[PDB]
Amino acid sequence: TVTIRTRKFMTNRLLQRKQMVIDVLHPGKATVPKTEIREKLAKMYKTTPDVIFVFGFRTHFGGGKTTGFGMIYDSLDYAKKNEPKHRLARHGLYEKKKTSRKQRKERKNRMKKVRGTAKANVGA
Amino acid sequence: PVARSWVCRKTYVTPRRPFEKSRLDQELKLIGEYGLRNKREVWRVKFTLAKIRKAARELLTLDEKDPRRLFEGNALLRRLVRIGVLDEGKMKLDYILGLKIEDFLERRLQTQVFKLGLAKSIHHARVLIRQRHIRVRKQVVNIPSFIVRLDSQKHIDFSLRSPYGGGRPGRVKRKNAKKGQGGAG
Amino acid sequence: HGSLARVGKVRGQTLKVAKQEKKKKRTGRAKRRMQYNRRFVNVVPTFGKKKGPNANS
């Protein structure tokens, strides 16, 4: 007894995708996890779960109904290409480096003192 | 520079006079028939009335056929006739003035659970609303203040998800139902 | 009678005896409803002169 209905559908030939407002009815249980939601669209649009991306869900007072803005693509090749990083990181296929912007600003202003191929020795 | 609004107003004005004998008696029985919780509550049903009434005298200064008055006529009126304060047979807007505080105070949801065959006393009703029991087309209102539309009124009831309607046994019924199992064993 | 020697005299020499107990107070509408009854829905139009609500002859 979990039931999905799409809403406001469009296709970007020029971004290579399906986009639409996914709409949910869920009387009785807590709001639902997204590896459940993905795989239920996958026989609404008979692709794999892999390509599809659904983010953002505001819920409804009294319990009942939530509202998302999922979007479906063509191939994985393109799915890394034309889409944000955070919305790959979630699905386990991008990882940015291990220094937050404390380190990196200290290290710019010590290169700024040193001159020439002396600049490489400040970095290890 | 920032990405915000600052926008807001008050909703109630306080009377020039303090310590009277003719007014201290009449605002305190508005708290009895309907079950309001403080003065403030009362003072703002008025301020919304007062507001309507000054615009009406603004329009009556104008001539008939003046195109602002016709348009802003209709609006000001229908705006009181989708929610049954004025009635169909008073389009004319002298009738808007002779129009008083008690008709606003009985559209409020609080009063609309006392009158309809679903609450025993009125002071029960302002505790049915706030304990999230009752709903208005599949949507739970939690708020007495809610002024009610005349389209809606036939759709008020007990929410599906409730012990006072359809559902699973509650906190205190099910505990002393669960206590009877713990006692015999 | 009283330079700056003579001060606190009476807050001093009064008979500091304790305050009493009583049953617990109510607030909100639940209160207000309380007073609504007192002054209106019940009472008798009593003969002649009305005694105030804190009255003692």
Next chain:
Amino acid sequence: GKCRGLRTARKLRSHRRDQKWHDKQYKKAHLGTALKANPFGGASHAKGIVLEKVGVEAKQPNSAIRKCVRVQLIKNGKKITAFVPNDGCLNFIEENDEVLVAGFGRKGHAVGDIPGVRFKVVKVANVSLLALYKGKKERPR
């Protein structure tokens, strides 16, 4: 109005200005002498170094010695007679303790019996002497 002409407009307007300087609650306002005198200089509170406790007599019909203080302020370095309010609270100023002085009711105009005195106490060093009366806070050692 008295000079009813249609193009008078300035004759009319040079006369009220002239006039309004006769107004008191205004001139007291529109010259620098009101703020030259004033201890607070233009302000709602201002703190100061106490220096001696002092009893002032009251004026007639009434009689009863009234308990005051003599403060030196900070900013100006000026000296004011002030006045404690509650019963038995003078036992709480020690000499050269600090106080937050305030006004007293009616702005540059005293209250009742006590002559000269236009100022009074709210605090005694970071906690209000109201509280001390009740006893809701007590004093450091």
Next chain:
RNA sequence: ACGGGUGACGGGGAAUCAGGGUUCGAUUCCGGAGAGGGAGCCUGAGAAACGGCUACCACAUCCAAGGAAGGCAGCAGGCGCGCAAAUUACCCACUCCCGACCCGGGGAGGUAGUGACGAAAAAUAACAAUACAGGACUCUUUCGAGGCCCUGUAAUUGGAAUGAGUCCACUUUAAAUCCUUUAACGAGGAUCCAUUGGAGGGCAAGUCUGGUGCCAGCAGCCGCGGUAAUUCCAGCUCCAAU
């Protein structure tokens, strides 16, 4: 006119309002000005620039004593002037800028923290039965009967509800938190305990008890206190906002 003063940056606007008016406007939009105090210029389409440059004045950072550089009215912070105002926290995800760029960078901006400056929704109980007190009404000159419609306050007795809370995970998101959703547990003094001010009169509410004895104090104005205080100090009661 000229001179002086202004607790004077200007303007879109703000508070008060029968009509007419009187005050305010350093501040998220436009226009001006300035980067401790004056002066002057290199580079340029665009500077008399100052997180560019050279002096002098006021001040401040090291020296192996010859020398050498410094300017938060940018963000955080801290000493001072005070009646008087927060974290040396986290990102380019949004928003837009710059560049040789679809690819970097941005205390500009975004997001959490402290915040009773102000504005808006809104808990501190609700419902049954047993004592008890008042008005119809059918009848009684008056007792009593029915109380159908109730009307009310009582550490009498009874279970129904809930939001404060503790806590698995979904959701939120650049990563968190918050609100929204959800199992598990969570109320009879519902101790899971509402204050702040007043009671002679203006002006709502005690000619009540127990202290003081023009003293101590109250009282914005008129006044109180003279060894029977409707006013101080306090015991029970009570009114007005909440």
